[PDB]
Each structure stands twice: as structure tokens, then as C-alpha cells.
């Protein structure tokens, strides 16, 4: 039962077994061969740069980017045979790391045993079609006399090296060509081959600002990601494509109108389900039903397609062995006649296990690997891990968080302020980013510190149309989740099903076209000329000069911008002393009244009696981020009492809804007695819509009004870092000029109080994070929920006057049976609304 991982060096000879001479799909029929290695069952590795559909100039670093975060370019990566052996030995160690945990051992088992359907929507109904490049590749087998031979091989996954971009990893299905259209068998439930362009050395980076839990000794720090977790992330897409459930529609497009908005690629609904967490209700409950019904129609078509098979093209393939494998893969049943049918009860378990089973957050808890909690957390510049083959840095059982080196606790193995021996910075020669300009003095801002806002057209409007109720209308499940522990329990109970010999007949029938590389390169930087001061001029004025020179602070933002030595600040009394030159007095009173000066100007907390949900209000948000109302220069509390929490937004949204169409009843036939099930479906579908729009309003908040709240916390963290770093340099200049006899003894006490600055700046971020998180909860549960509840109380009295008119029409069938007189008092739950659950739906009874 345990999975085996093979070992080889790149210089090992071809054996026509685990080491072959490949022909990748998109090389069908060109006689171009690359060396491949079988890492395990149905998985191969090709140490080559992904160069399909590309130009040699695409691998060069451009001047600026078109969309997304920073990208690193290097044409010389994976070039020599020493780089390919470095790539081969690293991938073996990452697969051993995944194997040594039962969560990763179950993920590999699902991928290996999910072989794709021989055939698709444009194959023949009576035969298995193992004769397209989308299911078969070729290899060349030499004899002792150097005489080659053409053969084929079946496989599920092939891992290459990275493309022009190194720190982005991809996974992809094979497109087909039919009547001049693109077609993916990995999206119709058939499955196909999934190819990887993986790079293990260059990893992304995140921080620790937003999270609720906070430790005063840990503070705020940045972290880098485990490449093993970056690989399992890349196997679930293969699992999704092997089952043919790749999603591609109901994407989300960002907004590209204002300047403070972020330009990125459209977020797909394939990527939000894989990551997991609270960013999974980003898709509304109504789209998840559309995706569920599509796969059900696809698997139903496969069941009928699999029942009419009689033969194949390869004369040696036993036709009975495969039909038991795909009744096992697709969870099919048999009727009394022998045809395969779809058991919906077994389909719901299988569909939830693939889409909402394996996530990166769940796999990170099982592997003790630290992950970000929000898809919208800040991404920094990527780093590289040069010593993955060093067990003192990374082993196949703990990764970077080794316990024998006190690195497992608090994920210090990934902390960049602690484990400095594990990562190195990338040279700026290949690192390319997208910069925006604010001229007013021109400043450049990256494409990662802005704020992601999407569009309104990207969100479903189906929960607004006409839904027709009948007698045979079923219920929506409203259940789209699956526990990872349940997958591990079922995996241990499995019987070892065996795959057949994966050798077949050569390929003769593909087409060797690769989809063209979509470029991201841009020639020029977008330059914005504005009139007024935005939030980024306020943050730029707080930056300290990178020189040991006299510095002062001022309350004028224009003085700090023009003058080099002057810095903008929003703590009035703190500016009183740092400018005062302490002459003739000890640093005891001078320095202490500078440390705890910042203490009681930073952790400021208040409440507003009009706003009951927010328990902590930080007043100095306004003056530090230029969040001010007309006629409120500094009166941040007075502007909050009038406008409300909407003032913190950079971008006010429309909070209304159009119209929620009444339900209609079309089952007029009362030919059979006790047709009252039509009443039950009308009550059940009434309850569903009240959950649909709710989770469709919970969907727009996560994608438009829960990102400007998060970035106020990031912008507050930078300002608090600018203010603290300024004070810590203000105090060093007066210390070098200080010429006192006690100077040598009080040195440790001076540095002891500079660490007190971070301790109070962290306590301030605790109040700020509670501010922005509760204010984000106060703009949902009140306003637009009360604007969801507003005219959803209208569809109710618009569906009783249709129901009771349907009840009054077929009234002569339900009387004198304790049914009609009962179902008029039953209309009390109709006076009761179904409330909202922000987080957990608690039931104390």
C-alpha cells in the first residue's frame, strides 16, 4: 500500500523503464526527444524549461509588467546538466516530504488512481480512444546495436521546469481542436494529462499584520513559503483536471478605473476553491449549484457513453479491467439491465471531495506549515532557497521548521527575521514589477501595495429571475464542503486497486499546436498627474532620509515632502520633544519622556455611542492617512458620528438591490390525491432564496468592501513603522553629540527603551486591527443586510398571495381532512424572517 518514490541521477543511462527518451504532447510527430524520469506511478519529470508556444525573447526580463505582482526572469535557469540534476534531486526530496505525511500520501493516491477517460466528447461511442496526444505520449527505445523503436506510454502527470517566469507555477490541461474551437477534456469530466512547469527554489513571501491572534514577543514579521506546500497546491489542480472538473467561468474581473486600485489577472473560480478558508464563500451559493449540476450532466453522459463500449484500438487491452476502474473512479452503479447509472448520493460525496476537500490551509495545518489566512494578504518580493538539499536547512519530515533546532515553535523556520540562513534575496536584474507614478515631485508605487477592487458585472444575478415551482422540483443541497480528516479515514480503509500496464500503441492523430504565450511585458510606466494630496503622499512624507543627519518632525505634510531632513507626524506632543534639544539634563528623563511619549499617543481607543458594533475606535486614523471630511480638518470623531464607518472607504459602493421576482406555481394538475408536496417545495424554495441573496451579499463584501478595510491596517502598519524608525534615529544623533561621564554606563538602558517602542507600536496595531475588523463587520450586518432584508420582506407577501390563490384554486381537494384549516395557522413561520449569521450559525437548543 505505501507509495514508492524512485531515485536516480540525471547522468544515469536510459533503461526503457524509469528513464526514457520522451515525446511530450505538443511535440506529437516532430521526432524531438527529451530525457524523462518516472518519479512514481503515472507521474513523470522532465528537467527542461517550458518553451511551448513561446519565443526565445519571452524569457528575458522586461522593463515593466502588464498585470499582477512581481515576476522574476532568468533565461539561464535549468540550462546545464548540473542544473537539471539539481532540479531532479530537489523534486525527489519534495515528493518524499509529501509522502511522509498521511495527508499528502492520500493526495498522491487520488492523483495516481484517477486515470483519464480513453476518449472525450469528440471520440467514438463504441471504443476506447487511446490515440490522441492528449492521453498518450511517445518514447524511443534503443537496442544494444543502437536501433531505436517507437512505442507509447500512458501517464497522468508530467512535471517540467518553469517558463519565462520562475516564481509563478502553473498546471494546465491539453486543449483539443474541433471545428476551429478550443476544447478541454479536463473540463467535461473525462480528464486528461496534466502538465506542470514547477520551480522549487523561488518562493513567495507574506507577513503577519492582519491576523487576529498576536504575541508581543513575536510581533509582526514576514515569512516565506515551503516549496513542498507549493507542490501539493499544484497537485490539486491536477486532481481537478484528472476528474475533469476544471472550472473556468464565473471569474471575477478587477476594477481598472481609479488610481488607488490594483491591476491583476482575473481571479478564477478554480483558484478560490483550492486555497480554502473564508475566501471560499467568494463564489455565491448559487454558482456552486450551477457548477454542481454541470458535472452531474457530464458524469451522466459518461455513464451512458461507458455503457456502449465493446472494443478498443489496441488489440491487447482487456476491456473488462478498465470498466471496473472507471465505475470506481466515477462512482457509477449498475441497473438490472447492466447499464451504468449515476448514484447522486455517491456523486455528492465524490464532487465535494475533489473541489472542497484538499485546500492549502488544511494541508498547512496537517504539515505544520504556516500559511496566509486571506487570499488578499500582502505579497512581498520573492526570495530563493539555494540549500534545499541540505538537511540542516530542510529535511523530508519537518521542512524548515525543524524541532531539533528550536525552529518548529511559532513557525520560526519560515520567519525571515530568525532563520536568515535559509533564504537569500534575488538580484534585481531579473526581478520585474509594475510601477505607478504620482507626480504633483513624482513618486512610484508598486502593483502590490494598492487595494484590489473588483467589478459589479462579475457577480451572479440569477437569484433575481423567475424560478418556477412544480411537484417534481428538487431541493438545492446548500452543502459544499468536505473534511480532510474524512478523506484520510476513507483512504486507510481502501482496498489496493491495481492499475494495468500503461504501455499502448503510438500516437498518430494529435495536433502539435500549443496555445500562444500570453505576454506580460510592457514598455512604459503609467504616470499620473494629480492636483491634491492622496494617502501615498502622506506616507511618503513620513519616510526618513537614509543618512545620519539631523532630523526633525513637523505636522505639515508639505514641509516633510519638500524638506529632506523633516518628517511628517501625527502625534502632536511627541513632536514637542524630539525637536527640543536636551541641554544640560540627563538622558534618563530625556529618553523616557520620548519612549512613553509614543506610548500614550499611539494606543488611543474610544467608542461612539451611535455605533454599537465597533468596540474600539482609533482617532488618529484620519490625520495619518488623509481620511477627512469637508469641514472636518482633524475632527475624525465628529465625521464618524455623522457619516459612519463608510468614511474609511476610499471607494463608496451602491448598497441597494434591484428586484427579487416572486416564485410562480405551474403544477396545475390535481389528478392524483395528496399533491401537497407542491406546497412543501414552495416553502423549501422560499427558504433557499433567503440563503442565496444572503451569501450573494456576503460575496460582494469579501470582494469589494473587506479589502479596503484590510489595507487600512497595512497602511497603518507602515506609518507606525515610519514613526518608530524616525524616533529610533532621532535618539541616536543626540547620543553621539552627548559628551557626558555617564555615557558609557547608560548605553544598555538607551537601547532597552528603543525596544519599548516596538512593544507599544504592537499594542497600537492590536487596537487598529480590532478597529478595522469590527468596522468591517459593522458595514455588513447593518446597512446592506438591512438592505437585503428590506425588499426581501417584499417577495414574501408577494408569494403568499400567489400561494393562497393556488391554495384557493385547488381548495376542494384539501378540505374536511384537517389539512386546509391546519395550513392557515401554519403560516406563522412566514411572519418570522430568517436572520443572518456573520460567522458561525450557533444553536443553543
Amino acid at each position: 500500500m505505501p507509495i514508492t518514490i524512485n531515485n536516480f541521477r540525471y547522468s544515469d543511462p536510459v533503461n526503457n523503464d524509469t528513464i526514457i527518451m520522451m515525446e511530450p504532447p505538443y511535440c506529437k510527430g516532430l521526432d524531438i526527444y527529451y530525457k524523462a524520469f518516472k518519479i512514481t506511478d503515472r507521474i513523470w519529470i522532465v528537467p527542461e524549461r517550458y518553451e511551448f508556444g513561446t519565443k526565445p525573447e519571452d524569457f528575458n526580463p522586461p522593463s515593466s509588467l502588464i498585470e499582477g505582482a512581481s515576476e522574476y526572469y532568468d533565461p539561464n535557469y535549468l540550462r546545464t546538466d548540473s542544473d537539471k540534476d539539481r532540479f531532479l534531486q530537489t523534486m525527489v526530496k519534495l515528493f518524499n516530504r509529501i509522502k511522509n505525511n498521511v495527508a499528502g500520501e492520500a493526495l498522491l493516491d487520488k492523483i495516481i488512481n484517477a486515470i483519464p477517460y480513453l476518449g472525450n466528447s469528440y471520440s467514438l461511442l463504441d471504443k476506447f480512444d487511446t490515440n490522441s496526444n492528449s492521453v498518450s505520449f511517445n518514447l524511443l527505445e534503443q537496442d544494444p546495436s543502437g536501433a531505436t523503436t517507437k512505442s507509447a506510454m500512458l501517464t497522468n502527470l508530467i512535471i517540467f521546469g518553469p517558463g519565462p517566469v520562475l516564481n509563478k507555477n502553473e498546471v494546465r490541461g491539453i486543449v483539443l481542436r474541433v471545428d476551429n474551437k478550443n476544447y478541454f477534456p479536463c473540463r467535461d469530466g473525462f480528464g486528461s494529462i496534466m502538465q506542470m512547469a514547477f520551480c522549487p527554489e523561488y518562493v513567495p513571501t507574506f507577513d503577519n499584520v492582519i491576523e487576529n491572534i498576536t504575541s508581543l514577543t513575536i510581533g509582526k514579521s514576514k515569512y516565506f513559503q515551503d516549496p513542498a506546500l507549493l507542490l501539493m497546491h499544484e497537485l490539486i489542480h491536477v486532481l481537478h483536471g484528472l476528474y475533469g472538473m476544471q472550472v473556468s467561468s464565473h471569474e471575477i474581473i478587477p476594477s481598472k478605473q481609479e488610481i488607488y486600485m490594483q491591476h491583476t489577472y482575473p481571479i478564477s473560480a478554480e483558484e478560490l476553491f483550492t486555497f480554502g478558508g473564508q475566501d471560499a464563500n467568494l463564489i455565491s451559493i448559487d454558482i456552486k449549484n450551477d457548477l454542481y449540476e454541470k458535472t452531474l450532466n457530464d458524469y451522466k453522459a459518461i455513464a451512458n457513453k461507458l455503457s456502449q463500449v465493446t472494443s478498443c484500438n489496441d488489440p491487447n487491452i482487456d476491456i473488462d479491467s478498465y470498466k471496473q476502474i472507471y465505475q470506481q473512479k466515477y462512482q457509477f452503479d449498475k441497473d438490472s439491465n447492466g447499464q451504468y447509472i449515476v448514484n447522486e448520493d455517491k456523486f455528492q460525496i465524490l464532487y465535494n471531495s475533489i473541489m472542497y476537500g484538499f485546500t492549502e490551509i488544511e494541508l498547512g495545518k496537517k504539515f505544520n506549515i504556516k500559511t496566509r489566512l486571506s487570499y488578499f494578504s500582502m505579497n512581498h518580493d520573492p526570495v530563493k532557497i539555494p540549500n534545499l538539499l541540505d538537511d540542516t536547512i530542510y529535511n523530508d519530515t519537518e521542512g524548515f521548521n525543524i524541532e531539533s533546532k528550536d525552529l518548529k515553535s511559532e513557525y520560526k523556520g519560515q520567519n525571515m527575521r530568525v532563520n536568515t540562513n535559509a533564504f537569500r534575496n534575488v538580484d534585481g536584474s531579473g526581478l520585474v514589477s509594475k510601477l505607478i507614478g504620482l507626480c504633483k515631485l513624482c513618486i512610484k508605487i508598486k502593483n502590490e501595495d494598492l487595494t484590489f477592487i473588483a467589478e459589479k458585472n462579475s457577480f451572479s444575478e440569477e437569484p433575481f429571475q423567475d424560478e418556477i415551482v412544480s411537484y417534481n422540483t428538487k431541493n438545492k443541497p446548500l452543502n459544499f464542503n468536505y473534511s480532510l480528516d474524512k478523506i484520510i479515514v476513507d483512504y486507510n480503509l481502501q482496498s489496493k486497486i491495481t492499475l494495468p500496464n500503461d504501455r499502448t500503441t503510438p500516437v498518430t492523430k494529435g495536433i502539435p499546436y500549443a496555445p500562444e504565450y500570453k505576454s506580460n511585458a510592457a514598455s512604459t510606466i503609467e504616470i499620473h498627474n494629480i492636483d491634491d494630496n492622496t494617502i501615498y503622499q502622506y506616507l511618503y512624507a513620513q519616510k526618513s532620509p537614509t543618512t545620519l543627519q539631523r532630523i526633525t518632525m513637523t505636522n505639515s505634510v508639505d514641509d516633510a515632502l519638500i524638506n529632506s531632513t523633516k518628517i511628517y507626524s501625527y502625534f502632536p506632543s511627541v513632536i514637542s520633544k524630539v525637536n527640543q534639544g536636551a541641554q544640560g539634563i540627563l538622558f534618563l528623563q530625556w529618553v523616557r519622556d520620548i519612549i512613553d511619549d509614543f506610548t500614550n499617543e499611539s494606543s488611543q481607543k474610544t467608542t461612539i455611542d451611535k455605533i454599537s458594533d465597533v468596540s474600539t475606535i482609533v482617532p488618529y486614523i484620519g490625520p495619518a492617512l488623509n481620511i477627512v471630511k469637508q469641514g472636518y480638518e482633524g475632527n475624525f470623531i465628529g465625521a464618524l458620528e455623522t457619516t459612519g464607518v463608510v468614511l474609511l472607504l476610499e471607494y463608496i459602493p451602491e448598497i441597494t438591490l434591484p428586484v427579487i421576482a416572486a416564485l410562480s406555481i405551474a403544477e396545475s394538475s390535481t389528478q392524483k390525491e395528496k399533491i401537497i408536496k407542491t406546497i412543501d417545495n414552495f416553502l423549501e424554495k422560499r427558504y433557499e432564496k433567503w440563503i442565496e441573496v444572503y451569501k450573494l451579499v456576503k460575496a460582494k463584501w469579501l470582494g469589494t468592501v473587506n479589502t479596503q478595510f484590510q489595507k487600512r491596517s497595512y497602511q497603518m502598519y507602515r506609518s507606525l513603522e515610519y514613526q518608530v524608525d524616525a524616533i529610533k534615529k532621532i535618539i541616536d544623533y543626540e547620543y553621539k553629540i552627548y559628551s557626558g561621564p555617564d555615557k558609557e554606563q547608560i548605553a544598555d538602558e538607551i537601547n532597552n527603551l528603543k525596544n519599548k517602542l516596538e512593544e507599544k507600536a504592537n499594542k497600537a496595531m492590536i487596537n487598529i486591527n480590532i478597529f478595522m475588523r469590527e468596522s468591517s463587520r459593522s458595514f455588513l450586518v447593518n446597512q446592506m443586510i438591512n438592505e437585503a432584508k428590506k425588499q426581501l420582506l417584499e417577495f414574501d407577501t408577494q408569494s403568499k398571495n400567489i400561494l393562497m390563490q393556488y391554495i384557493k384554486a385547488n381548495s376542494k381537494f384539501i378540505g374536511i381532512t384537517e389539512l386546509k384549516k391546519l395550513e392557515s395557522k401554519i403560516n406563522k413561520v412566514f411572519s418570522t424572517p430568517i436572520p443572518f449569521s456573520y460567522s458561525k450559525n450557533l444553536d443553543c437548543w
Epitope: P572, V574, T599, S603, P619, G634
Partner: antibody
Framework: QVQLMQSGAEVQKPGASVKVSCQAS????????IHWLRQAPGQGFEWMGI????????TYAQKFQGRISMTADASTTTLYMELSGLTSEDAGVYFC??????????????????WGQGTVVAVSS | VLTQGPVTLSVSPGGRGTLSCRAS??????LAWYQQKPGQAPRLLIY???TRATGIPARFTGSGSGTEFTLTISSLQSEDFAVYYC?????????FGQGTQVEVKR
Amino acid sequence: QVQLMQSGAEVQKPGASVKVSCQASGFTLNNYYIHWLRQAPGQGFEWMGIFNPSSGTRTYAQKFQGRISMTADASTTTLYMELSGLTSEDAGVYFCARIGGSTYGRLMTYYFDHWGQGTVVAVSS
Amino acid sequence: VLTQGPVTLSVSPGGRGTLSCRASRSISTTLAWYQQKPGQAPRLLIYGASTRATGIPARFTGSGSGTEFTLTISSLQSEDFAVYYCQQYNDWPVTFGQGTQVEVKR
């Protein structure tokens, strides 16, 4: 009962020193901003200085900057006002005032509700 | 600076008065009102432009538009003969007005 008492000013000479005190009674002192204020023989109100409950934050008005200092002792429930370099424009009655609502968290910005009774600073030749 | 000019104001007992507090754009914060007699400690009348503490009778209240604020009193008595101050802030400290002495019957 809530009370502040102040003591420690009489009649001085130009350029000497004096030190003044403000002892609370009736609440938890270590949770409130406490100001210093004054009034001259004839002119109106003029804020002079505030310190902050953590023996912490403090500013001064422009007319005494670098010439006066504020600090407190969180263990004897007392705050003080240092005067250094006295001239003929510093006479008047001085008050110490705590800000209110600091029971709901000390770091309230802008408030106050209660002074004591005031002692006379007097300077002359 | 906070202007309370003219520094005096007179009204017969039991009528309606106004004391104004003109500021500037370099203010825009909360404002507090304070009744004051020299043989006594100042009394908090209004805080936060509007909020009135318990113990202040139902006569003291006000408003505050743009860069100006005012104090309003109802039913004047003889005990209201005192000096009144408005107290605001800027980006640095506390700032008081020149103060306004209110005469009543004579």
C-alpha cells in the same frame, strides 16, 4: 468623593526656582490625562501643559517651552510642575485638571471635567 | 486662536442669550464650554460641541457650524453672572478663548 489638592507656591524673585504639586484623592490616578493650566492677574485662560497618565506623553505651550517640565510618580499619586527661570510674566493662579471618561480606557483624546482650587504663583522685585 | 469678542454681554433676567466662539479652519475639533467665577473652580458646561454632563441644568446647550461655535443659555438668573470660555484644539495642544463675562440685572 473625588478631590485634587495643589500646594507649593509663594512669593519668589526673578530667575529663581520653585516646584509645585498636585495630589489626587478619590480615583485610580494612573488612568487619566492631567493638565496644568493658569491665569494671569487680568488676562483670561491660557493652557500651559498636559501630561499623560503613564507618566507619559506631554506638551507645552509656546511661552514656556524648554523653561518648564512636567512629570509624575505613579507610586505616590502625585504629579508636579517644574518652573525654571522665572520672570515677571509668570504670576497668576495655577490649576491641575484631569480629563473625564478615562475610566473607560485612559488614552482619551481631548476631555476634562474637574479642577482643584488653585494656589497663587507670585513673582516680583 | 479662539475669538469671543466682544468680551462682554448683557441681558435682563430670564431671557435668551448667545455667546459666540469664532475660530478658523486650523481647528475643527470638539469644543467645551465652561462657566467660571474667580472665587470658585471652573465648571464644565458643554463638552464635544453638544454633549452636556449630568448636573448641568436644562438651560445650557449649543451648536457649532463651519468654523464658528456658540453657547446658548435659557432663563437667565442672577447666579449666571460669571465668565464663560470656549476651549478647542489644533494639531498641537489645548487652546482657550479670551473669555466672555455675562452681566445680568442692574
